[PDB]
Design a protein around this ligand. Structure first.
Ligand SMILES: *[C@@H]1O[C@H](CO)[C@@H](O[C@@H]2O[C@H](CO)[C@@H](O)[C@H](O)[C@H]2NC(C)=O)[C@H](O)[C@H]1NC(C)=O
Ligand SMILES: *[C@@H]1O[C@H](CO)[C@@H](O[C@@H]2O[C@H](CO)[C@@H](O)[C@H](O)[C@H]2NC(C)=O)[C@H](O)[C@H]1NC(C)=O
Ligand SMILES: *[C@@H]1O[C@H](CO)[C@@H](O[C@@H]2O[C@H](CO)[C@@H](O)[C@H](O)[C@H]2NC(C)=O)[C@H](O)[C@H]1NC(C)=O
Ligand SMILES: *[C@@H]1O[C@H](CO)[C@@H](O[C@@H]2O[C@H](CO)[C@@H](O)[C@H](O)[C@H]2NC(C)=O)[C@H](O)[C@H]1NC(C)=O
Ligand SMILES: *[C@@H]1O[C@H](CO)[C@@H](O[C@@H]2O[C@H](CO)[C@@H](O)[C@H](O)[C@H]2NC(C)=O)[C@H](O)[C@H]1NC(C)=O
Ligand SMILES: *[C@@H]1O[C@H](CO)[C@@H](O)[C@H](O)[C@H]1NC(C)=O
Ligand SMILES: *[C@@H]1O[C@H](CO)[C@@H](O)[C@H](O)[C@H]1NC(C)=O
Ligand SMILES: *[C@@H]1O[C@H](CO)[C@@H](O)[C@H](O)[C@H]1NC(C)=O
Ligand SMILES: *[C@@H]1O[C@H](CO)[C@@H](O)[C@H](O)[C@H]1NC(C)=O
Ligand SMILES: *[C@@H]1O[C@H](CO)[C@@H](O)[C@H](O)[C@H]1NC(C)=O
Ligand SMILES: *[C@@H]1O[C@H](CO)[C@@H](O)[C@H](O)[C@H]1NC(C)=O
Lengths: 314, 160, 226
C-alpha cells in the first residue's frame, strides 16, 4: 500500500451542523478545531508525497519501441494496452477490478490521477526493458534484452553462456510465469488483501465517525436542531455542551487513529519506494528483498492506492 | 422545491433542498432515513407527497496564491462544488476561479489536485494538466548497445 | 579530470546552500512543526472552556471554594485535554523523527563507512563515496556518484564464432564500430582486440542466437612462430 484516501473533516460543521449557538460554544474550546483540520491536512499532503516517492523515480517518460523483439521474452501483458481508454496494462486492469459526506467530511482527489500513475509505471517498465538498469543511474542506454538478461545472470552468479544457451527455455519459463500471474489475480481476489485492508480500515473509521453523531452523550437529543427548537438558549447551552464534548472527543479519536494509520502507510510507501529503486531500477543482492529466489529483475504495476511488483527470480 | 430552504415539518427543523422523490414509501411510512441514519426524505403533512431532502451545497474554499512577494493576484478553488452554485474553469478538484486554463503542460508548481496544477506566469495565474516529464523513445534494437565514452563525478546533497 | 570534476561539484554545493534556503526545508519543517505545537499549547491556556475566566487566579479571587471548584474543574478538564493532545502528537512526531534518524544512521553506515551497491540509496548515480556534514537537528550527506556523461551507439553481439566454438566475454561486452569487433567493459568505452584472455569458450555457434563471426586472436601463436 502506497497511499490512503485524503480525507478532510470540517469540524465546525461536523460538531455543529450549521448552528450558530453551537458554534459560539465551540469557540470556548479554543483552537481544538484548527488543530484537527491542520492534522488531517498534513496527512492528505503526505499521501500525495507518498505516491510521488514511489512512482516518480523516472527522469523521462520512456516509451517501448513499436517492434517488441525482446529475445522471445513477452511483456505484452504488463505493457500498456493503447486501445483501452486509460493506458493500463492487462495486469493493471485486473488489479483495479479486484480492489473495491454531507456531515462536513469530504474526500480530496489525489494529485496524480490513476492514468498518470499508469504512465509513470509504463515509463519505468519501458526503461527497464529497453535499457536495463542504466536509466536509474543516468541516461537510458539501450541494450538488447537478451544481453541485459545475461548481465543479470552474471549478477546472480551464473555465467552469461548459460542464459544464451538456454535463452528459448528461459523465455518460455518467463512467459509461462507471467501467464500464471494473470490466472492467480483473475481467480482470487484475496491476493490484494493488503490494499483492501487499508481501504476497509479507512471506511470503518469514517463510518464510526458518522455514527457517533447519533450518540446523545447524555444530552436530551442527539439532534442539535431538536435541542434548540425545544429549549431556550440558557438551558439549551448545557445540552449542547454535552453534545460538543462528545462530538469533539469522537473527532479527536478519529484524527489520532488516522495519524497513526498514516504513519504506517508512509512506512509502507517508503518501502515501496526503496523496492522501486533497488529492485526495478537495479538488481538487488539483498536476500528476499525482491521476491524469493535470486533476483533478476522486477516490474512495477500500478494498483489502487498501492503498487504491485512482479519479481522475476532465478 | 429545488431551492435551499429552512423547512419545518411537524416541528422537525432542518435546512435543505426539497425535491420530488422517486422513493417507494409504503402508506404508513412517515419519513425516510439513510445508511448513516440521516433523515433524507419526508412525507408532506398537508399533501400526500414524498420529498427528498438534499443538504444545501457546501464545499471548502482554497486560495491558490503565488507568494505575496511575487503578486497579490489570487485564484480561488471551491472544492467539490459545481460552478453554477458559486477565468472560471471546472476541474475534478472543484470550481477554479481566477485562473486561465492553458493547454500547454508544465511541471507541477502548485497542486490544485486531480492532475491539475497552477502557476504564476507571463502576469496571470494559469491552470494546466501537469506534465509527467519529457517523453523519450529509447533506441531499442536487438543488436544495438549504447556504451558511455565519458563520465561526470557528481555530488548531491541529502538532508535528513 | 576526476579531481577537477569533484572539486567543481563541491563548489556548486557551496553555491546552492549559500544561495537558496529552501534546500534545508526538511530540517526547517521539523522546527516549525514543534514550534506550532508549542504555540498552540500556550494559546489553549487562554481558552475559557466554559469557565467564567480562563485565568485561574481570577476564578479563585472572585469565587468561594464550592463555586470555584466547578469553574476550576472545567479549566482542568480543558487544559488536561489540550496537553494530552499535545503529547500524543509529539509521540507520533517523535516516531517519524526516529525513523529518519534510523535512516540517517543506516546511510551513515552503508554510504559513508562503505560503498553502497543499493540503487539510489546513496544518491542518483553509481555511488562512490559520501561525506557527512553536521546540520542543526539533522545531518547532511554529500553523495559523490559516478554518472556516465556521453555515450555512443555500437552494434553488439552476445558471442563470436571462431572455429565453430562460441566465445563470450569474461567481463565486458562485444562491440562493433561497424568494421571491426572489440570487447569493452560495459560502463566505459575501452575497446580491446578480442583475444582468448578476454573471452571464455562455451559450446558451439549453433545454439547461441545472434552470434556473429569474428576472429579471436591467440597471443601464444605469434610467440610460437617467433
Ligand atoms: C505474448 O503472449 C500473449 C498472450 O498469449 C499474446 O497475446 C495474444 O495474441 C493472440 C494473437 O497473436 C490473441 O489471439 C490472444 O487473444 C492474445 N492474448 C492476450 C490475452 O493478449 C501475444 O501476442 C504474445 N506476443 C508475442 C510477442 O508472441
Ligand atoms: C529444466 O527446466 C525446466 C524445469 O521445469 C524443464 O523445462 C522443460 O523441458 C522440457 C524438455 O526440454 C520442455 O518440453 C518443457 O517445455 C520445459 N518446461 C518449461 C517449464 O519450460 C525441464 O525439467 C528441464 N529442461 C531441460 C531443458 O533440462
Ligand atoms: C570528458 O568530459 C570532460 C568534461 O567533463 C572533457 O574535458 C573537457 O575537454 C574540453 C576539450 O579539451 C575542454 O574545453 C574542457 O575545458 C574540458 N573540461 C574539463 C572539466 O576539463 C573531456 O575532454 C571529455 N573526454 C571525452 C571522451 O570527450
Ligand atoms: C574501427 O576501429 C578500428 C580499429 O581502430 C579501425 O580499423 C583500423 O583502421 C585504420 C584506418 O584504416 C587502420 O590504420 C588500422 O590498421 C585498422 N586497425 C585494425 C584493428 O585493423 C576501423 O577502421 C574503425 N572503423 C570505423 C567505422 O571507424
Ligand atoms: C560464419 O562462418 C561459418 C563458417 O564459414 C558460416 O557457415 C557457412 O555458411 C555458408 C553459407 O551458408 C555455407 O556455404 C557453408 O557450408 C557454411 N559452413 C559451415 C561450416 O557451416 C556462417 O554462415 C558464417 N556466418 C556469418 C554470420 O557469416
Ligand atoms: C387540507 O387537508 C386536506 C387533506 O385531504 C388536503 O386535501 C388539502 O390540500 C389541505 N389543505 C392545505 C391547507 O394544504
Ligand atoms: C522577496 O524575495 C526576495 C528573494 O528571496 C527577497 O530578497 C526579498 O527580501 C523578498 N521581499 C519581501 C517583500 O519579502
Ligand atoms: C455540474 O452539473 C452539470 C449538469 O448536471 C453536470 O453535467 C456536470 O458534470 C456537473 N459538474 C460537476 C463539477 O459536478
Ligand atoms: C486548447 O484546447 C481547446 C480544446 O480542448 C481549444 O478550444 C483551444 O483552442 C486550445 N487553445 C489554443 C489552441 O490556443
Ligand atoms: C542511436 O541510434 C538511433 C537511431 O539512429 C538514434 O536516434 C540515437 O540518437 C542514437 N544514439 C546515440 C547515442 O548516438
Ligand atoms: C533482429 O531483428 C531483425 C528484424 O528486425 C532480424 O532480421 C534479425 O535476425 C534479428 N537479429 C538478431 C540479433 O537476432
Amino acid at each position: 500500500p502506497v497511499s490512503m484516501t485524503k480525507t478532510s473533516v470540517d469540524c465546525t460543521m461536523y460538531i455543529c451542523g450549521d448552528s450558530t449557538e453551537c458554534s459560539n460554544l465551540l469557540l470556548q474550546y479554543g483552537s481544538f478545531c484548527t488543530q484537527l483540520n491542520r492534522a488531517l491536512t498534513g496527512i492528505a499532503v503526505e499521501q500525495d508525497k507518498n505516491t510521488q516517492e514511489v512512482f516518480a523515480q523516472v527522469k523521462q517518460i520512456y516509451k517501448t519501441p513499436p517492434i517488441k523483439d525482446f529475445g522471445g521474452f513477452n511483456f505484452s501483458q504488463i505493457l500498456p494496452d493503447p486501445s483501452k481508454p486509460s493506458k493500463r496494462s492487462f495486469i493493471e486492469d485486473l488489479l483495479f477490478n479486484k480492489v473495491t459526506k454531507f456531515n462536513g467530511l469530504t474526500v480530496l482527489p489525489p494529485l496524480l490521477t490513476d492514468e498518470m500513475i499508469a504512465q509513470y509505471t509504463s515509463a519505468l517498465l519501458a526503461g527497464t526493458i529497453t535499457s536495463g538498469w542504466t536509466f536509474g543511474a543516468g541516461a537510458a542506454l539501450q541494450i538488447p534484452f537478451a544481453m541485459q538478461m545475461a548481465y543479470r545472470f552474471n549478477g546472480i552468479g551464473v555465467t552469461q553462456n548459460v542464459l544464451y544457451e538456454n535463452q528459448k527455455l528461459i523465455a518460455n519459463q518467463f512467459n509461462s510465469a507471467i501467464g500464471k500471474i494473470q490466472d492467480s489475480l483473475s481467480s482470487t481476489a484475496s491476493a490484494l488483501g493488503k490494499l483492501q485492508d487499508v481501504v476497509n480500515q479507512n471506511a470503518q473509521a469514517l463510518n464510526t465517525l458518522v455514527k457517533q453523531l447519533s450518540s446523545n452523550f447524555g444530552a436530551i437529543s442527539s439532534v442539535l436542531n431538536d435541542i434548540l427548537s425545544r429549549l431556550d438558549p440558557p438551558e439549551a447551552e448545557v445540552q449542547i455542551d454535552r453534545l460538543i464534548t462528545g462530538r469533539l472527543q469522537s473527532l479527536q479519536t478519529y484524527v489520532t487513529q488516522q495519524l497513526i494509520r498514516a504513519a504506517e502507510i508512509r512506512a509502507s510507501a517508503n518501502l515501496a519506494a526503496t523496492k522501486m529503486s533497488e529492485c526495478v531500477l537495479g538488481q538487488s543482492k539483498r536476500v528476499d528483498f525482491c521476491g524469493k529466489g535470486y533476483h533478476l529483475m522486477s516490474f512495477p504495476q500500478s494498483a489502487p492506492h498501492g503498487v504491485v511488483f512482479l519479481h522475476v527470480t532465478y | 422545491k429545488n431551492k435551499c430552504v429552512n423547512f419545518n415539518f411537524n416541528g422537525l427543523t432542518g435546512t435543505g433542498v426539497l425535491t420530488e422523490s422517486n422513493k417507494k414509501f409504503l402508506p404508513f411510512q412517515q419519513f425516510g432515513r439513510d445508511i448513516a441514519d440521516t433523515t433524507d426524505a419526508v412525507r408532506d403533512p398537508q399533501t400526500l407527497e414524498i420529498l427528498d431532502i438534499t443538504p444545501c451545497s457546501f464545499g471548502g474554499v482554497s486560495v491558490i496564491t503565488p507568494g505575496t512577494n511575487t503578486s497579490n493576484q489570487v485564484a480561488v478553488l471551491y472544492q467539490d462544488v459545481n460552478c453554477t452554485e458559486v477565468n472560471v474553469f471546472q476541474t475534478r478538484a472543484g470550481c477554479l476561479i481566477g485562473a486561465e486554463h492553458v493547454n500547454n503542460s508544465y511541471e507541477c508548481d502548485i497542486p490544485i489536485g486531480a492532475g491539475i496544477c497552477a502557476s504564476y506566469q507571463t502576469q496571470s495565474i494559469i491552470a494546466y494538466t501537469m506534465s509527467l516529464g519529457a517523453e523519450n523513445s529509447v533506441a531499442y534494437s536487438n543488436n544495438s548497445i549504447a556504451i558511455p565514452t565519458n563520465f561526470t563525478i557528481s555530488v548531491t546533497t541529502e538532508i535528513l | 579530470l576526476i579531481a577537477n570534476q569533484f572539486n567543481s561539484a563541491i563548489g556548486k554545493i557551496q553555491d546552492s546552500l549559500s544561495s537558496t534556503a529552501s534546500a534545508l526545508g526538511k530540517l526547517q519543517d521539523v522546527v516549525n512543526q514543534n514550534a506550532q505545537a508549542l504555540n498552540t499549547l500556550v494559546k489553549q491556556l487562554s481558552s475559557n472552556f466554559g469557565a467564567i475566566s480562563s485565568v485561574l487566579n481570577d476564578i479563585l479571587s472572585r469565587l468561594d471554594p464550592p463555586e470555584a471548584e466547578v469553574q476550576i474543574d472545567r479549566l482542568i478538564t480543558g487544559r488536561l485535554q489540550s496537553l494530552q493532545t499535545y503529547v500524543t502528537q509529539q509521540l507520533i512526531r517523535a516516531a517519524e523523527i526516529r525513523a529518519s534518524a534510523n535512516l540517517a544512521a543506516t546511510k551513515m553506515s552503508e554510504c559513508v563507512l562503505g560503498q553502497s551497491k543499493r540503487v539510489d540509496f546513496c544518491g542518483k548515480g553509481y555511488h562512490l563515496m559520501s561525506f557527512p556534514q553536521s546540520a542543526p537537528h539533522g545531518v547532511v550527506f554529500l553523495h559523490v556518484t559516478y554518472v556516465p556523461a556521453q555515450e555512443k551507439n555500437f552494434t553488439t553481439a552476445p558471442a563470436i564464432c571462431h572455429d565453430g566454438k562460441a566465445h563470450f566475454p569474461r567481463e565486458g561486452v562485444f562491440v562493433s564500430n561497424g568494421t571491426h569487433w572489440f570487447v569493452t567493459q560495459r560502463n566505459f568505452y575501452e575497446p580491446q582486440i578480442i583475444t582468448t584472455d578476454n573471452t571464455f569458450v562455451s559450446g558451439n555457434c549453433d545454439v547461441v542466437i545472434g552470434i556473429v563471426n569474428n576472429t579471436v586472436y591467440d597471443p601464444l601463436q605469434p610467440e610460437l612462430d617467433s
